[PDB]
Design a protein around this ligand. Structure first.
Ligand SMILES: O=C(O)[C@H]1O[C@@H](O[C@H]2[C@H](O)[C@H](O)[C@H](O[C@H]3[C@H](O)[C@H](O)[C@H](O[C@H]4[C@H](O)[C@H](O)[C@H](O)O[C@@H]4C(=O)O)O[C@@H]3C(=O)O)O[C@@H]2C(=O)O)[C@@H](O)[C@@H](O)[C@@H]1O
Ligand SMILES: O=C(O)[C@H]1O[C@@H](O[C@H]2[C@H](O)[C@H](O)[C@H](O[C@H]3[C@H](O)[C@H](O)[C@H](O[C@H]4[C@H](O)[C@H](O)[C@H](O)O[C@@H]4C(=O)O)O[C@@H]3C(=O)O)O[C@@H]2C(=O)O)[C@@H](O)[C@@H](O)[C@@H]1O
Lengths: 380, 380
């Protein structure tokens, strides 16, 4: 039985079982994944401190990014204050190295940790640990356990919690560190430092003003907040809190966001309405990967107001078959392949064979190096 | 006004009205002077400020990534890259000269124009500093070629498509004519830049990449000639400008415009309204130069009788209502581009509907966008 973590544990356990029994199809698949993983073994571990422009704290270990839809105002002499263009990503975001480096770290750590769990080969735990130590716990290179300056906006007067959503990029890596416990490379001291960092990060996200505000967000930010929360809580083995968060925060939030026809009105007012409708459910999907490991199914458990997350999947399903039929603003193309994992997850949780069949028909590329697809041989 | 890449009529009128002390223009130039202060302070940029070197190992070689080419996730190393028309690969921002050519071009153009209008030596001093560093400096100046522009990892054959990047610094080249005669731009400076532009002119006319780009069947071929005219006008080659116009630009226009005035090579793109407009922007900037020696590219026919104004007529209804556009346009079209374009084509054609619409669309009075400096007429 796989340790509690941010992944479909049923698929992960099955891949490990089949691999240990030498089943040929799974062994060929994992051998491919191991070739894909070679670049992560050699990759130099990344650090949030690898930036020149420092945050207002003057601390390179503070994570800082630009909120992506905020641009300089050319009618202002210094371009300040920035103005918002919903759905139009300002390429200035790439001047903050931790934006993409958190992605690269998260991919590397997730891939290596999962491969260690499946294959038991110490080389994957050793490399996973090198990435985790550098990003999280190292006294010079590790990030401070906060998100004070995530998605800052030049010229903005008020403090915001919106940047907290960036945390999903490294909180999955945090969760996967559970898979390398017991390896030779991940020492009792390593685990203790990471536990303390995760405890400090959990305190910040629950008690800071930005964390409190983000926990109250009425749209996909509130769902992603709790999906990240669960990752941290599961890493810390706080199973009672996971139930409380599922029952007292996620399900009420999910219930308040679903209209009578199943649409997500908060996401429908966005310029990328099909993207953000899907993004909201992806938060619930990743949350459910964790809650369901302790017996709570977020796809089929109704909220206090009678709304159930399956209703939102039902509304969006025809538009995953034909994204061109989408009638609300979507100023960029929608990546239909996102529906593969989503419909498989919701389909399996709901016993809806039509969703699962469509999930497989859309499918994922057998040889893709996208690390989030590693558990989904069933879709390849 | 000296021969260069700008609406000479608008520039002369601004200088004349500034020198007369006309109130409305004087206020406007004063605002442009406050906008230009950041370029006085700005450290000059160099193509050599990169870590990943081009295959020549020469940091003075300009190198960028062709914007629509992406790693193939189904390949272990992502090679060869694959094309996704209209989807810019954020990897392009890892090549510093992509955005640095734009920032240099903006600084040199704004300072040169403000020197021409005001006669204030501080603007030529700063303009010269940017020009020397980018173009002629024996260590920081770029080599006069575009061999590695828009390279594509894994691609076997060389291409000339990256040449279109040159428009970002070739407008700065031509604006150097505005600072000749100042105290800061010495006879030595001018000779070095003349020699560079002659070597760049040789490379773009005789290299295989330049030859191939000169025969491209779409907006690349038009942009190639607009760039060609900036270089030739900087070198005062007025007879070559006439030849290029008659033997290259007009035949391309006659081939690329369909009987109904549409641009079929641009209609097959995923950003078909953007690239139709981009084609006409190439003709627009070409015409700004040719009309200074008596050649109107908006109304001079090709040998088959077609005129570029037919392409304007075709797109005009969609500049009024971009939502009516019927071909693939996977990102929104910025309507404000129609302002300068319709004003240029409108005045060159005596079409008062075009000019009025251009004023109705308008430009922001206080915008810092440097291409809009000559267009006070659009800012009322
Ligand atoms: O590129 C990325 O980092 C990822 O972006 C992901 O989408 C996030 C963004 O990162 C931002 O955080 C963005 O924040 C939004 C809020 O969700 C919200 O819409 C907010 O709207 C305000 C608005 O600022 C204004 O004050 C107005 O008057 O009121 C609005 C309101 O109350 O609704 O604006 C924020 C903003 O843009 O700053 O939102 C999304 C999100 O998750 O909703 C995601 O696209 C991911 O795939 C990217 O990788
Ligand atoms: O750099 C920017 O962001 C600016 O880009 C401007 O658009 C340019 C691009 O930079 C590229 O150079 C792009 O090149 C295109 C060609 O125009 C052409 O479509 C070519 O088509 C081939 C294709 O490569 C492929 O082999 C296919 O099977 O056959 C095609 C064919 O010829 O039929 O593909 C090139 C490519 O994508 O590499 O094109 C544009 C352009 O000017 O057309 C511009 O968008 C600007 O606003 C940006 O700032």
């Amino acid at each position: 039985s796989a340790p509690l973590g941010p992944f479909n544990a049923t698929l992960l356990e099955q891949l490990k079982n089949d691999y240990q029994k030498g089943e040929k199809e799974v062994t060929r698949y994992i051998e491919l994944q191991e070739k894909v993983a070679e670049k992560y073994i050699k990759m130099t571990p990344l650090s949030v401190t690898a930036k020149k422009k420092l945050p207002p704290s003057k601390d390179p270990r503070d994570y800082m990014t630009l909120s992506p839809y905020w641009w300089p105002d050319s009618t202002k002499i210094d371009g300040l204050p920035y103005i918002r263009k919903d759905g139009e990503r300002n390429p200035e975001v790439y001047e903050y190295p931790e934006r993409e480096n958190a992605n690269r770290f998260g991919d590397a750590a997730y891939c290596l940790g999962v491969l260690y769990y499946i294959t038991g080969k110490e080389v994957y735990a050793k490399a996973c640990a090198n990435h985790l130590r550098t990003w999280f716990t190292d006294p010079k290179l590790g990030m401070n356990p906060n998100m004070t300056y995530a998605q800052a906006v030049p010229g903005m007067k008020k403090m915001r919690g919106s940047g907290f959503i960036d945390s999903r990029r490294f909180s999955r890596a945090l969760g996967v560190a559970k898979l390398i416990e017991g390896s030779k490379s991940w020492t009792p001291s390593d685990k203790k430092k990471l536990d303390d960092w995760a405890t400090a990060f959990c305190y910040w996200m629950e008690n800071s003003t930005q964390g409190q505000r983000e926990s109250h967000a009425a749209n996909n930010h509130g769902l992603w907040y709790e999906a990240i929360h669960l990752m941290v809580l599961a890493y810390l083995d706080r199973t009672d809190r996971i139930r409380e968060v599922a029952e007292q925060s996620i399900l009420p939030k999910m219930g308040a966001q679903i209209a009578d026809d199943g649409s997500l009105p908060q996401e429908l007012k966005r310029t990328l309405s099909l993207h953000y409708s899907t993004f909201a459910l992806e938060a619930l999907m990743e949350a459910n990967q964790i809650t369901s490991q302790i017996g709570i199914n977020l796809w089929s458990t109704p909220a206090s107001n009678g709304k159930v997350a399956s209703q939102a999947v039902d509304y969006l399903y025809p538009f995953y078959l034909n994204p061109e039929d989408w009638k609300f603003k979507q100023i960029k193309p929608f990546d239909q392949s996102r529906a593969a994992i989503l419909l498989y997850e919701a389909g399996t949780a709901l016993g809806n064979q039509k969703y699962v069949d469509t999930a497989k028909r859309i499918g994922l590329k057998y040889s893709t190096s996208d690390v989030e697809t590693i558990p989904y041989l069933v879709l390849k």
